[PDB]
Design a protein around this nucleic acid. Structure first.
Lengths: 225, 166, 137, 335, 35, 415, 30, 91
RNA sequence: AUCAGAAGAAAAGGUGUUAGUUCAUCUAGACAGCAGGACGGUGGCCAUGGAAGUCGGAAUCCGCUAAGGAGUGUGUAA
RNA sequence: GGAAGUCGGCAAAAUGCCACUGUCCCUAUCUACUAUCUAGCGAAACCACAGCCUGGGGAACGGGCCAGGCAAAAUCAGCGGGGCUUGUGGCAGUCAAGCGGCGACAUUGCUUUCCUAUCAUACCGAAGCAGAAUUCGGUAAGCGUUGGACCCACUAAUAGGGACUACUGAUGAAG
RNA sequence: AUGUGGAACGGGGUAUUGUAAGCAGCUGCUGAGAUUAAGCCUUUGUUCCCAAGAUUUG
């Protein structure tokens, strides 16, 4: 795992997005943030220096996996054209004309399973299955609808609220077919999606995350090999 | 950092490179700096330096003198103590204790004012207990009933400084 | 506590909510109303009532709410605005109702899910609100 | 309150903004002009990509209000030399051309119609028959004079106005030596100097004008002012049907909005697109000069790439840029 | 706040005027000057 | 308990000069005889009131910033009695408070009398009589202010010992290898010299082990230094790590060290003792080992071995007392981690920055990384608009064939 | 002037300087 | 901690100072006329100022020293800078 | 005199200047400037983690003398 | 936005704690009339003589005096302007520079514009000032010193004080 | 003081409003109709006017 911060903010889940096929980072601000992502994934996956809707919070405004990427209807044609030019062919890009524009705060997805804010429209569910090629479950985490921000999820693990009950963790893990952990981040910051960005081989966390959590993410996401 | 950390730093890394030169030159030029300070400054800061230089001059004269010796409205407008009370006697002007200094003993003793003997200003002041200069007052001297004379002005000083008549 | 942990910097925009104004509670923290008592970062402009805007922090009192959140004046982030404000893009925006969220001075909001649209400005500045936002336009 | 640097608040004793300061002359630089003279046609707004690093909208689209002023190429019609003296600059001599057009001759009379049109007859006559006097005077300028300022007059005929008296002013000539300035001045008699050869679409100029007269509120308005740091966005040519077409727009169009500029007319000459406001109302002559000083603030150095320029109808609420597009959208009218 | 009347603001302003920052103004006028 | 936040004390003369200078500068100065008596009274009362506020404001700052010995953790409380004689400190702190009321009473008195001032002079002398008294009141605490400044000066030097966190207190005879262990464990640099009593006072140092932070507080050997060590061991949740000079290279008899450890055993009660055999590479030991709490860990002080093992043993004792196929790319399995030294690390955008002008100047070429058939067009501008219509809506890789499949059709309509 | 005050003593000062000098001399005589 | 980087131009009449105390301000000085600045190899990281006029050499030595003064720190601990070591002659 | 000049603060201060008054050494070399010595009982005695003249309390003595003060300061844990 | 203005629901608005309101933030626009100009008609109060400013003239210092600053016709419309004093108390004894018994310090006894005397911003010197934060002091009045009932927040800070002619615009004869 | 002269209308463009009467079976003629410079742009459109009077000027 890595400790990195955007500007002087620990919430690097907001300011960037990362999947098994690409990496999206904010623009015009700290290119040191681009350097951090490039230092670990520069020669493996493309690192796109992009923006969504003229904002630096692209991480919470998009949702994607190794196969497809989604953007809200608020994104410009120019920014969408930029993303498709930079991104390679095997990754599909789509505009999701959907109820709650912030896709990152409502949808957390991997290559095989996605968790969505129940309050999404049926056509959105259909296109997510069509694009992401994952099974869609309209469930909730810790009683909170914002699955994407409170459930940092990857191919080899997942993290949720420490508050959620043990039976709830077991239900989510069994329905996700992946080990799950109820942990914390950034010294009591319960927005796990907004603090931790994870792929199947690397993970980044805020600078304010202590060593105890970093060991926990290392164990659950098994980056040691 | 722990305890005398700068002392440790001085020990393990040394002081500034030119530190001795700077302090020696500062120790060299204050004689010129003092005269420049004495001739150019004006006002209170000047006056304070004026009196403090006399302090050091007199001191240095004495320590050197010791050296060859070694080598060799109807109201009361004054302080009061407690019809006849026609005027108003404020509780503010009321006085109860006095600083009476014995003549032979030479110690200023805090003694309560038993009463006022006689006011040289006028009999009305003595009747009203108006404390003034030269007025005789009797106080208890059990811890030392004796008379005394006021050596101060309670109206201005605000403290009843008196000398025992003994 | 003003301008604190707000990531970058905020472009100038029209002032919508002066002192002693009522806004809806936007999150599900349990509050209904907020009352502006003071505005952070106001200079010595004579006879100028401090005013709030999207992405701004104001000392707020929960006028209507459960008594535990009441009786303690604390900062709040104005998340929406009714007065028309122009983006640097040029388009002019305005919402139906003045809304605000309940936030600690550090920047972490006290709610769990905010209701309705979110100003794109405040989502840019405040990553914590962007962490807990539903839809931003 | 009110600034004390702008009093006595009284009506400007001039209509064309006086350039009270010219850039410092440096002989290391060779010769160029230092000012120009245009007419405020009006303003529109644009969309631009913003390449300012660290700005919150780096590489993002903004919208900017731009002032369009039409500048038909000025005509140089004389040369003047100022000599340094302990009592200040003093105009030593003046030399003119032969063919001074009727536009500038009108400047010398309050009644051009009733006059006998007798300006510059003897001078032009002696100019042709004996050029030794002109040579002697230019010899004097290159021998004594230290500041060389050329008379240039604007071709108000091309402007869509009703005025006919051309405007006349003194552009200083910075660069080279005094001999180089006089040679440059003599080689441009009776010729025209175009704004494309004076400003280059990206520099940061200072705009001088007289404010719009608001009336009596003491006197308010109609004051001489000097905007500094006004940045050129686009120097367009009046001959091209692409002067309002960007690289992101195509759409063959002209800078003049739908229906002509309000209270000005149709701009069919070389024009300048400055940013933001400029002093004075429309159809008032503005003066443009190079900045007196070098300031390389990042705003003064960064390049500009206009994405789209607006030619809607400023006379109301326009919603169609070009008449072709209006016909395509609107159904075929009964006409 | 350091005021624009500061001699050190003016001093560093000078050194900016002696980089390529002003070079893009020296030959920048040479553009028109060959026309 | 960070004692560094205490403002520095003036030395009386400065205290009066600062107070008197403030009164002259912040309050009015000019008055004439012809002014109304109310204005004359109001003027001088303002100075008398103002100086009292200045004196009290300074005095309260001392009284609040200093730590209240009763309300603090008895570790630091017991540390301060040995260093600062709590009675002397309490007497000093109390005297300033008695001073604080005394200035208030004199100020109230002379303001009260001044209401009856009849001429400019009589108010002038009460003001002088005032300013003299609060000046003379303060001058009597010369010893108290000097004592507090010395106490302040040494308080700011003390290390903020951590009582809540897990700790490993180290104690023993002087020069018994404790300094070497502290240097090897804690990043702090404590001077180690053959001179005895080098550890003048407690030295605190934080260490990280088992994903947790432990505070090692070295104590002076064994008296004021011995009393500090005893008090530190008295109230501190920590494991005893006494180091015994087995080789007797420390200059003290092994029996003497055993006797000292037995004497300190009363303080070491209810703690995880450690029987460190210092200078192992370089009788009563069986009696000490019979206790069982102390763990016999050999420590090669001369050979500089076993320090890490001792720390690991101590930490362990303290802890006891308290389908989803992740297709990682093949390049990831052989990726060289970016470390700046080696040139191997591919350049980064951070490095392209510093060569090209730094932050705020370098314009990142956003178009510089499009996967595209050509890197020349890599800066081209794509049309966005034309004739009321967006270019974007028409971009189709096969659109040319839709245009030809057309050409037949219009040719049909014209015919 | 060039000073912080006026060197020309106004006739009040020319008036009362001499008499207060006279009172000073009388004080020494007493 | 931070090495002081020195660059010599115009046969050593202008000195460029970099990385002083981690600062990225380029402390540049022009030596007074008749003063030449060189970097000696026999002793590491020390400078030799040669000239004919003592006033100009000494003032140039003073100018360099006052350019690199520590600021807002302690003379007690941050005792970093350039100091004049020896004051002699060519032969 | 970086704001000189053409009885009230007033008494005091000034490495400003010029004259005097009263004392001092001086080609047995004056003052300063330099080279060198500036000692040995003794780290005298209580005092202490460590105090050696210089954290601290009384003397504070003696051999050589042309001179070395149980010490004038800096300083060292010493 | 809806009492933050104001001692305040003064006056409108809402109808014939909630709610409304330009009282305020912060004013903007629109209409009529007065207003200005033109043709006509056409007063009175008041009037020693007059009308630039700084300082001084014993007072009362002034519009005349003195010393200066200065000073170019005729007008039009607004605005009404007209050697004090400070930062350091009182009693008693002890010295003792010295003078002629006092005796100096010290010691012991008890109880709009302006000013800088700068709150903030600029710089500076000192402090056990590691960093940060801060304290004291110096130069410094260029520039700011807020919004609500001693308070309670904001803020970099919410420092202490003095007090006919002119003014503002508009024409204008003339070397 | 006779010309890419000036004016009065008119046409076109741009605009504001929101589809005029009447006819025919709410619908269609009807983005119609009206207003458009009074501080909008333009005019080969039609007509007229001007190649003057007074005063002051070395």
């Amino acid at each position: 795992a890595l400790r990195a911060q955007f500007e002087n903010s620990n919430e690097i889940g907001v300011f960037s997005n990362l999947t098994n096929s690409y990496a999206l980072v904010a623009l015009g601000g700290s290119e040191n943030f681009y350097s951090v992502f490039e230092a670990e994934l520069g020669d493996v996956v493309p690192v796109v220096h992009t923006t969504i809707g003229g904002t630096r919070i692209i991480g919470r405004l998009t949702c994607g996996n190794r196969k497809g990427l989604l953007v809200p209807s608020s994104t410009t044609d120019n920014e969408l054209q930029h993303l498709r030019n930079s991104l390679p062919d095997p990754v599909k890009i789509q505009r999701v004309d959907e109820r709650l524009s912030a896709l990152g705060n409502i949808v957390a997805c991997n290559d095989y399973v996605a968790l969505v804010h129940p309050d999404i429209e049926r056509e959105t569910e259909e296109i997510i299955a069509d694009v992401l090629d994952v099974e869609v479950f309209r469930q909730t985490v810790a009683g909170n609808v914002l699955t994407g921000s409170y459930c940092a999820l990857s191919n080899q693990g997942a993290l949720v609220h420490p508050r959620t009950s043990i039976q709830e963790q077991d239900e989510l893990s069994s329905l996700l077919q992946v080990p799950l952990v109820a942990g914390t981040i950034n010294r009591g910051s319960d927005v796990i999606g907004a603090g931790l960005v994870v792929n199947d081989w690397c993970a980044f966390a805020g600078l304010d995350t202590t060593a105890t959590e970093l060991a926990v993410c290392e164990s659950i996401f098994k980056l040691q090999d | 950092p722990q305890n005398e950390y700068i002392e440790e730093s001085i020990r393990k890394h040394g002081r500034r490179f030119d530190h001795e030169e700077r302090k020696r030159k500062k120790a060299a030029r204050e004689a010129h700096d003092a005269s420049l300070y004495a001739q150019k400054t004006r006002g209170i800061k000047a006056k304070l330096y004026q009196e403090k230089r006399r302090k050091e001059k007199i001191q240095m004269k004495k320590t050197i003198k010791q050296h060859e010796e070694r080598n060799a409205k109807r109201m009361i407008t004054k302080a009061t103590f407690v019809k006849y009370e026609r005027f108003i006697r404020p509780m503010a002007l009321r006085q109860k204790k006095a600083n009476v200094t014995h003549k032979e003993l030479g110690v200023t003793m805090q003694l309560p004012i038993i009463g006022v003997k006689k006011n040289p200003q006028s009999p009305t002041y003595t009747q009203l207990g108006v404390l003034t200069k030269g007025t005789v007052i009797e106080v208890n001297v059990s811890e030392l009933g004796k008379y005394a004379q006021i050596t101060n002005n309670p109206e201005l000083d605000g403290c009843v400084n008196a000398l025992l008549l003994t | 506590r003003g301008r604190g942990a707000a990531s970058g910097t905020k472009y100038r925009m029209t002032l919508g909510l002066p002192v002693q104004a009522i806004m809806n509670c936007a999150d599900n923290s349990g509050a209904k109303n907020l009352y502006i008592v003071s505005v952070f970062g106001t200079g010595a402009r004579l006879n100028r009532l401090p005013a709030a805007s999207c992405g701004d922090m104001v000392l707020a009192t929960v006028k209507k709410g459960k008594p535990d959140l009441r009786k303690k004046i604390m900062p709040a982030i104005v998340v929406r605005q009714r007065k028309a404000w122009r983006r640097k893009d040029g388009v002019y925006l305005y919402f139906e109702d003045n809304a605000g969220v309940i936030v600690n001075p550090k920047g972490e909001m006290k709610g769990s899910a905010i209701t309705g649209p979110v100003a794109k400005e405040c989502a840019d500045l405040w990553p914590r609100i962007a962490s807990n936002a539903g839809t931003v336009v | 309150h009110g600034s004390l640097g702008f009093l006595p608040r009284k009506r400007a004793s001039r209509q064309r903004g006086k350039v009270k300061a010219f850039p410092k002359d440096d002989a290391s630089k060779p010769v160029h002009l230092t000012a120009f003279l245009g007419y405020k046609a009006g303003m529109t707004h644009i969309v631009r990509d913003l390449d300012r690093p660290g700005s919150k909208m780096h590489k993002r689209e903004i919208l900017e209000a731009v002032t369009v002023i039409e500048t038909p190429p000025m005509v140089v019609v004389g040369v003047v030399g100022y000599v340094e003296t302990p009592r200040g600059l003093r105009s030593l001599t003046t030399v003119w051309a032969e063919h001074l057009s009727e536009e500038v001759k009108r400047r010398f009379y309050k009644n051009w119609f009733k006059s006998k049109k007798k300006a510059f007859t003897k001078y032009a006559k002696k100019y042709a028959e004996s050029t030794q006097s002109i040579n002697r005077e230019l010899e004097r300028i290159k021998k004594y004079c230290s500041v060389v300022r050329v008379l240039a007059h604007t071709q108000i005929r091309k402007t869509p106005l009703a005025q006919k008296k051309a405007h006349l002013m003194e552009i200083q000539v910075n660069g080279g030596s005094v001999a180089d300035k006089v040679e440059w001045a003599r080689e441009h008699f009776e010729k025209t100097v175009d704004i494309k050869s004076t400003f280059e679409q990206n520099e940061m100029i200072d705009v001088i004008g007289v404010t719009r007269g608001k009336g009596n509120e003491g006197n308010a308005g109609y004051m001489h002012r000097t905007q500094l740091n006004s940045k050129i966005y686009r120097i367009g040519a009046g001959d091209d049907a692409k002067n309002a077409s960007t690289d992101f727009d195509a759409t063959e169009k002209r800078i003049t909005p739908m229906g002509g500029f309000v209270r000005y007319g149709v701009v069919e000459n070389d024009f300048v697109m400055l940013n933001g406001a400029t002093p004075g109302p429309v159809k008032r002559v503005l003066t443009l000069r190079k900045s007196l000083l070098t300031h390389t603030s990042r705003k003064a150095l960064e390049p500009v790439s206009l994405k789209w320029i607006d030619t809607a109808s400023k006379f109301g609420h326009g919603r169609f840029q070009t008449p072709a597009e209006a016909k395509q959208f609107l159904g075929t009218l009964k006409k | 706040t350091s005021g624009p009347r500061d001699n050190n603001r003016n001093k560093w302003a000078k050194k900016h005027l002696k980089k390529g920052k002003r070079a893009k103004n020296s030959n920048f006028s040479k553009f028109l000057k060959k026309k | 308990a960070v004692f560094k936040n205490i403002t520095p004390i003036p030395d009386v003369n400065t205290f009066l000069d600062v107070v008197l200078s403030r009164t002259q500068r912040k309050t009015p100065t000019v008055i004439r005889s012809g002014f109304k008596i109310s204005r004359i009274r109001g003027f001088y009362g303002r100075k008398v009131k103002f100086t009292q506020d200045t004196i009290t404001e300074k005095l309260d700052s001392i009284l609040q910033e200093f730590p209240k010995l009763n309300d603090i953790h008895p570790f630091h409380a017991d540390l301060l009695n040995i260093l600062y004689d709590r009675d002397h400190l309490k007497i000093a702190l109390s005297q300033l408070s008695t001073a604080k009321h005394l200035v208030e009473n004199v100020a109230r008195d002379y303001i009260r009398l001044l209401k009856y001032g009849d001429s400019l002079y009589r108010c002038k002398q009460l003001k002088r009589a005032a300013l003299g008294r609060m000046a003379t009141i303060i001058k009597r605490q010369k010893s108290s202010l000097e004592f507090l400044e010395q106490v302040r000066q040494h308080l700011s030097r003390l290390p903020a010992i951590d009582p809540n966190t897990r700790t490993l207190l180290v104690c023993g005879y002087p020069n018994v290898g404790k300094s070497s262990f502290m240097n090897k464990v804690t990043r702090a640099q404590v001077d180690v010299q053959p001179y005895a009593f080098t550890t003048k006072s407690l030295f605190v140092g934080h260490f990280d082990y088992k994903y947790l932070r432990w505070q090692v507080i070295d104590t002076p050997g064994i008296n004021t230094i011995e009393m500090q060590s005893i008090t530190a061991m008295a109230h501190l949740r920590s494991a005893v790590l006494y180091f015994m000079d087995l080789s007797e290279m420390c200059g003290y008899s092994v029996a003497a060290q055993v006797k000292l450890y037995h004497s300190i055993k009363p303080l070491f009660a209810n703690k995880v003792t450690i029987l460190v055999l210092n200078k192992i590479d370089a009788e009563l030991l069986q009696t000490i080992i019979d206790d069982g709490n102390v763990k016999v860990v050999q420590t090669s002080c001369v050979q500089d071995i076993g320090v890490m093992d001792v720390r690991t043993t101590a930490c362990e004792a303290l802890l006891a007392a308290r389908a989803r196929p992740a297709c990682i790319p093949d390049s990831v399995k052989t990726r060289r981690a970016y470390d700046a030294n080696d040139p191997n690390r591919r350049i980064l955008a951070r490095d392209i920055e510093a060569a090209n002008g730094g932050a705020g100047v370098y314009n990142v070429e956003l178009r510089d990384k499009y996967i595209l058939q050509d890197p020349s067009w890599k800066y081209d501008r794509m049309p966005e608009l034309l004739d009321g219509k967006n270019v974007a809506d028409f971009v189709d890789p096969e659109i040319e064939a839709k245009l030809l499949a057309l050409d037949e059709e219009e040719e049909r309509l014209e015919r | 002037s060039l000073k912080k005050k006026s060197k020309r003593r106004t006739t009040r000062l020319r008036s009362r300087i001499e008499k207060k000098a006279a009172e000073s001399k009388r004080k020494q005589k007493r | 901690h931070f090495p002081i980087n020195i660059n010599l131009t115009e046969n050593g009449t202008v000195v460029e100072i970099r990385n002083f105390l981690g600062e990225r301000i380029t402390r540049v000085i022009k030596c007074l006329p008749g003063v030449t600045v060189s970097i000696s190899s026999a002793v590491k990281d020390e400078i030799i100022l040669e000239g004919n006029s003592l006033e100009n050499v000494s003032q140039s030595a003073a100018n360099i020293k006052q350019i690199c003064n520590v600021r807002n720190k302690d003379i007690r601990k941050f005792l970093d800078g350039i100091y004049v070591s020896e004051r002699g002659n060519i032969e």
